[model samples]
Target: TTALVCDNGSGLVKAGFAGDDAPRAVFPSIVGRPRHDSYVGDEAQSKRGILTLKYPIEHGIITNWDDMEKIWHHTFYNELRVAPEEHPTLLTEAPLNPKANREKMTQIMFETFNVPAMYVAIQAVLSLYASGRTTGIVLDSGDGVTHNVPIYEGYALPHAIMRLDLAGRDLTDYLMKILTERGYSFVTTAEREIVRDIKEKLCYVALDFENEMATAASSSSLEKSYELPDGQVITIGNERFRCPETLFQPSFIGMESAGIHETTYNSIMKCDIDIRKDLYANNVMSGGTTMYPGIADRMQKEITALAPSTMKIKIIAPPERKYSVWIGGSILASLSTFQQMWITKQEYDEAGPSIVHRKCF
Candidate 1:
């Protein structure tokens, strides 16, 4: 049987069969309901103001199981058009996921969906695998959070893992804030969506923050005009690069935590000295937030400055990075060696949810 791979990020869900190059379905990880029927994904996005929106996942963790089940149902029956009972399912989870949540997820897969078997993998580790490396540092920044994970021989070093509260949504909000202060209103839900689109289309990291700021301050050459839905033109200038700058300098958003590059370097330093050089050489970038132009270059430059003068710093930004977690799961599930790794229905039936910890980890 062909296995099912699902990468359930806070902002989107990517679901497809194993051995596929891309997910069959990629949709917003949001559910909406009017007074009558409920909708998921793009449909929910379309409903907007008419429907009450709810986020099933928050900060990369499933918080509303009922809504999450609805999303899974939509993925299985509506999107993939497959019966869950026939396919072994591969799911991705955030780093340091709680034991109870994993057990609950396992229970749901076995008892509720009746999947033949299942395997849960860490998103960061899977991202490293997507970059074709078993040993490296994965800097994953998605909608909800940013995680700096160091892996050695396919295993994540839990002690060295660092997470930042800032990510894509925060950046979007920052962009909106900047526009609002500039006399543009993005208060409505529909308007906020436009703002998000604007951020995705225009925002980029600066290779040199000071120089970029000086350039913006001196002239309007960096400004780009965007026409709103109401036909009013709004000029976007420094806000494009400033939004993403929050990732490198959290202090821009009033967060005292270290920047992503600093956190990544700190994470590598936490590891043993023997593998630190390998980690530096194989830095992997994953998630949608990392898609910003010049991000990889900026990250490499900043991290390099913080490392030893002789240490090599390489940031691998794969073409399929935004969907890397799902791609990795797709690759792993299709491998013949991975066949025995799945927790069979028989094992789940006998040992219950506890079998997941023993079998998957």
Candidate 2:
């Protein structure tokens, strides 16, 4: 039987069978209760303002176990239409995830769903694997958080990991603020979705920030109009590049921390001096927020300025970066050698949930 792979992010969930090119199900990591019953993913999203919505995961950690269980149940039964007891499952976890959470996850997969076997893998390491490398620096920016993780030979260097609070959500809020100041109002829940759509469709990182700002200030050439759900068209100028600019210069949105590139450099410097060159040479960009146009070039240029003259910096942006973690899980679970790595039901029953920590890592 084919194994099952699931990558659960704070913003989205990707699940499918191993050896596939991509996930069979990719949906929001949110659950909604309209009245008497619950709905997950796209069904929940469709309920919008009328339903009571809850996010099972927050800032890359699972917060509500009940809600998360519903999401997993939906994935196994409805989304993938598979019997849990038949396939070994692989799930992804965020960098620095708490140990208790891992134990709880293992318990759920074995006790409740009765899966034959399971493995929990770190998100950063999986993303690095997707880039076709076992050692590299992964800059993963998603809807909830941005992580700069340095991995060596398929293992993450915990001390060298760095996280930036600003991510896709902050950019959306920044765009909303600027647009509101310009006379547009996006107060309702549904309206906020429209604003997010605008940001994804039009916003991009500026390679030359000062030059772009000067051009926007002097002329209307950069302005692009977008139609709202109500059929009202609004013109957006500097906001297009300004929103994503917050990633590189977070102070633009009043954030007190260092920018993404600065933090990436800081993360690499925390590692051993001998490995710094290799880390810089194999920098990989993953997650949805890293999909913005010109992000790779901008990141390479900025990081190079902070690095030593002799250091060579390379930034790789894979075409399927948004789903790279899931893809990596798919790749791993399909390998013949990897089949022996899973913690089987017999092992779990004897050793208890603590076995996951020993078997998976």
Candidate 3:
């Protein structure tokens, strides 16, 4: 008779039994296993295990159900203290999941866990509830994936959107590779662990590319080498590392895929022309990848250049953008009227899985 809410992203997974614990146990959704069967999570990967790691996801989506299930069960079992038979649970499946995939997920919840019914919701809608952004775009860039959706009164922009195979993982890998080939000791096995931290703390999205380049070329800071948490040191004074340039030259580190700007344009174009124009009026950028310094500026330039010269592109990156969705979720939990939307168990069993979408609506 309890609801199990899940805020699952390839990068982060927060799940808790309905009305149980406040946090419901959240963790990085990714499990960097060191081997085919070897498992890892929490502080596991950071220990520097030499076992080959298998990324359960590619770009924020399941690539191998069995592998994911293996990891998920471990995480849930250890954290949630709930087993697969915990039927009648609210499991958060993917939005835009294929019909077959959706069905498989239902089977997993119902048959695997003996759950009587399952409820599925997209991260976009949940994000809206969390952020209380009634009429704004939900740009979720995470792990190896990025998705942009315009949410309106619990509805999403259908059609004019797609996922890009570029995200924080890609950027990190790119930088890792760059350091490897360049013979930078800063990227040694242990040293690489702190790159994201360094990138995170020092990086800033630049307002102007040329100006940023000039700043990084400055004698004062550009040459200032920083000591990473792992006792590694490196010099980086450019806007590129200050945090937001990844939206532009993603390939600077071998991330040959579409940069954030290109993907943003493509995602915006997926909507109808009228709404497409509206998507930009309030360009809200979030996720870890957006941490790059000068990211907003780079995105503004790229989007403006791609659009008609007359179209104005205003880009804003909120403070603590990385935790925007989390803040949103916490706010949603605090709302007084939110309980009006929760569905009861008896109602779920009576209507069944076929009525999930309607119930969610």
Candidate 4:
């Protein structure tokens, strides 16, 4: 049993083997050309023979096969340091993976690597199962998209899947615009160096939509400033302030997007309302976004507040929220007794591309 996971999210192209070791390295989805010192992620982001970069993944899906192959093979072979043999391997896919895309990907895995067998997966369902629950919602919020899916008894509730264009990446772009107005644009070299720090340290989701914004604004102050690499100090505090509230209020930033609370309720309602009642009794969360501080608690608070007040709102443990799917793949790999999930080169030689899409469960 060999497991491989690939998450082509907006910010990252995360891939790894499902063994004792976890994913070791991640490259930005950006594409940059080689420079004297370092190569940027892609040419779309830089100019000259330098840091020009291009990101081929738009909404958690790959659009560039050539560059993607080069980046993936290099990173997987040399960087991750876990090259598989000239045999079949298990690769993950989104649950509602389109026939064309899934077929193409399977062929690539087979032709690019000496993979033999393949498996398609829905990321959210895998995540929810990894949370160790038979039921719950998996909320994944990243750069290009926010996807929420319900898992009932280890299967995907198709009707319950919901997606919106509100993700962390969207908020960053919004925040960048506000910062630009305040003269914090990365146009200057000094400011560019601090985007990552500012992004991670100051970003958060507000517990209360209408109420928490006021509370956070009141807390917003310029008590602290970020010193630029060039010795310019940028006054920022709650001033460069934000709360996850931005996710719900796309209109505030003058964009169209679904609100978080409504999205959650809609996903819940999308499920078979009958089974959902029992499923709600053991709801769980997964995906990196679930790791936000006070996320689970706030979710309970919001759900209860939105409910008819007569209903109960309960949440499951969140100790391993972000790595749920990876861990599940890992555990599956660690087991000594399991059916083989790997496909070998011999089978591929006989089967060809059609074999790539074959289910290997």
Candidate 5:
């Protein structure tokens, strides 16, 4: 049977049928209510004046079920063109998702869509699956938050997981604030999109932050000019490195959260001591924010420094890190062994939504 896999993310929702190497549709979490039509994804970005842009999710939680339902309805019908009745579906849930939310999601999948079967796996677990490893630490730094999740032989160590509010959204807002402070003016909510774009295009982790900051004093090799949509030219200086540097030093943004490397170390320490070396050497970090240049390199350096000097450290941040969880879901759904893992509709009908707690998790 064909299986539909969706990695529902705070910034973007990656959805498609399973067994494929990549998702068929990747779109923003925002929906648009325009004067003429209501739209989602790229269509929403094109709509004009007097519009209301709504985001269904915030900080990795589904806050607006109606808009989220609308997004999925459009995705299933218009985007992937799949009939929900015919296929089993699998979804990636946030690591810290509430139990009530899980029950609600199961209710929607079975009662609303009438799918044959369903399963919801944590995103970080799926990320590790994407790297072809069942046990390791996953550092997922996306638009909403950065999560350090450790898995032991396919099961997550919930007590060991670490989450931080400092991520892409925070970086975008930080960049906006810093630019405004530096005499760059950007007003209106939509203009925040430009700030996001600037962050994605210009930001990169600094392997040598001290020297990078020193060079930015005169704007030597680090300066790049970007033309705003309003036809204004703005030159970037220290903002390029300084913004992304927050991932390594959250204190820069006035937050007290531990950095990704430190968190990884702490999370790994919470696991079995026998496997700490395996986790240290097999650090898998894949997410939108982790795709920044020098991210993996810097993480590698920091993690190595934290661990035994002889133990090697590796940070896996593939080019497809943006969609790794979805791709991993595709990988999982295609496995013959995974067929029995799906929660059949009969199980749900018999035990009710709580079956998700027993059958999937």
Candidate 6:
């Protein structure tokens, strides 16, 4: 059976069949409706005649149905080159996704694309599965936001969920601001993507922020040079660590929020005291932002500091942190137990979209 796994994320959607280690088709969540021809994913942004670009997922939710419909069209027909009717699809949803959205999604999957069977799994819980654990605390920091999801016996504790406004987009904007301050301006929409590249390659979370800055400030060799799209080189020093520091201290940029580690502690504390130690032991950091160098180590140190002295802290960061949710979805979909969990088309026909409340939890 060809079961498709789609992690419909904020910035990009990772989609493909199960049993694959990584996404076979990863595309931007945007659909470009041009004057002549509309396009989805990178194909949409690869040319010039775009009148309006639409994003299906905004702030980690599916706010636009039209573009979302267009996105899956591209994914199945264009990218994967598979007919949706032949396959059972499993899609990952955000932690607190609205019930109406999933109902609409079920309607779309069954009515629009005509998939045989469907399942929607929470992304944070999937992230935990990616780390080879059923119970733990998942710190998912992505483009739009950072979420602290505490899992107990493979289930997410919704009441204990925590989030912050500081995330990858915030770091990108912060980098843009600092670049502007340094008299470097990228005017083109495409050229501005260098900011993301720089963030990924040069930026790192520093365990000792001040000490790292002092070292980089003093030694010229400590600085790295990044050439812009226009062939000019800009020296990167303290800005490397400084930009990612905002995750640890969002107030550095005037935003009010606790650091990612602090939010992790806060979420875990909301659970029973006896289980807090277990959650701490199996701390898992997943998502794009966590891919930055030293992030896991920094998080481990910070979370360890906030916990009891006797408690052991271990953070499981898979190699491809960005694809953790999708990978988890793929793993779960491949399981024998998961085959029975899908809400069948016949079931939906009888109970309607409201059946999602009873069948899919």
The lDDT of each candidate is: 0.89, 0.90, 0.59, 0.59, 0.85, 0.85
lDDT of 3 by residue, 1-361 (tens): 4445655567666666554424457676555554534555565556446554455655655677776675567655787777645533444444476666655555555544555445566655555555545555666776657777676556776675556666676555555655555466455545555665655566666656676577654555444466766575676545235334554566565556676677777777766677666567667776667666666676777678788777767676776566555445444433455445444444545664444455433
Model 1 RMSD in Å is: 1.5
Better of 1 and 4 by TM-score: 1
TM-score of each: 0.96, 0.97, 0.77, 0.82, 0.94, 0.95
Candidate 5 TM-score versus the reference: 0.94
Candidate 3: where are CA atoms >4 Å away? 16-24, 30-38, 46-50, 82-95, 114-117, 180-183, 186-191, 222-224, 229-232, 239-244, 253-258, 297-316, 320-361
By lDDT, highest first, what's the ranking?
A: 2, 1, 5, 6, 4, 3
Q: What clash pairs does model 6 have?
A: none
Better of 3 and 4 by TM-score: 4
Candidate 2: where are CA atoms >4 Å away? 34-36, 359-361
Which runs of model 4 end up more than 4 angstroms from their true locations? 1-3, 34-51, 187-193, 209-212, 215-228, 237-243, 316-320, 335-338, 341-361
Where is the poorest 10-residue window by lDDT in model 4?
36-45
Model 2's lDDT to the true fold?
0.90
The ten-residue window of minimal lDDT in model 6 covers 47-56
Residue 60, candidate 1: Cα error in Å is 0.8
Candidate 5 wrongly placed segments (more than 4 Å): 33-38, 359-361
Per-candidate clash tally: 0, 0, 25, 30, 0, 0
- Deviation (Å) of 135 in candidate 2: 0.8
Decide which is better by TM-score, 2 or 4: 2
Better of 3 and 6 by lDDT: 6
**Candidate 1 structure, TM-score to reference:** 0.96
